[model samples]
Target: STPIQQLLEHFLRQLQRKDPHGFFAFPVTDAIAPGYSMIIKHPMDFGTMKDKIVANEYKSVTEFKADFKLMCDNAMTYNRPDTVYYKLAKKILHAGFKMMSKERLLALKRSMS
Candidate 1:
């Protein structure tokens, strides 16, 4: 059996292609629960994007946000921003993006101003 993390990595990539917005919100749901489930194709490799974020390869908040904003821009441009899909994409974008320390967030904010 594949490790859960590896399986999740594959699942996330498929979700990315099938539903970019939904992929961002995957952490918010569960599959194969006592009362709920979804069928995901089995056994796949992880993506570079996932690995880079986890590896802290972006080096600075600005770099990370730039790449992230590109993603958000694509999502919003292709879909109606007011719709549930774009909204979830924005929410999940920040939710995943905001895992930094308060100091880093503050610095990032100041840099933007």
Candidate 2:
């Protein structure tokens, strides 16, 4: 794998650990989440992110970050503020931003370089 791919995978692993319940681990299907497709135009999840990494679809860390945000955003958009999924998404999104912060990623890039 490329350096970026390796870094992304590492980041993904770290973020995935924050979700013990695996709520964001896979896509929310229409069966489980009725009208999800109609509500969330752009769906994202850890599983799809993993596939993107394998396919080398991401050219930069920003692209990966966008997908991560989309995944959480979709949950937030679909579930009400009082729901567990919405609360979990907020927590995960905060944790993920911290982990993948500009300074943190810059340091990693420097070390890799």
Candidate 3:
């Protein structure tokens, strides 16, 4: 869990070395604030994600965007650095949570009769 959390946070800090515009900019230290409510410009299921969470259903989409954006921003942004890109940070945290969720589930399974 600690490794996953640190990895995501580290990846986020790496962005400061890339985006000058801060388009992907977000925070890791004070995660009290959720970063920009990402708008998927041409999403296939735009409204469904929120609904799933609201409905107590489940899904995982951010990492897909996170990984894609991380690679794209790093490659296309002239390698400009000096901002905490939000999307990448979010992805790393998301990936961390995903790992935690699995760990919790496995722990539950192991303890069950």
- Alpha-carbon TM-score of each model against the true structure: 0.39, 0.94, 0.27
Error of 3 at 43 (Å): 5.9
RMSD, every candidate, angstroms: 12.4, 1.1, 11.8
lDDT of 3 at 88: 46
Model 2 C-alpha lDDT per residue in residues 25-104, reported as the tens digit of each score: 88899999999999999999999999999999999989999999999999999999999999989999999999889999
Best candidate according to lDDT:
2
Give residue 69's lDDT in candidate 2 (0 to 100): 96
Task: After superposing candidate 1 on the true structure, give the runs of residues whose Cα lies further than 4 Å from its correct spot.
Answer: 1-22, 25-48, 54-56, 93-113
How well does candidate 1 match the true structure in TM-score terms? 0.39
Model 3: weakest 10-residue lDDT segment is 39-48
**Which residue segments of model 3 deviate by more than 4 Å?**
1-50, 59-81, 87-95, 98-101
- Give the per-residue lDDT digits (tens) of candidate 3, residues 1-113: 34334434443444334445554343212243233224222221212322333453432334433443444444234322443443544444455445445576578569765
Off by over 4 Å in 2: none
**C-alpha local distance difference test of each model:** 0.47, 0.93, 0.39
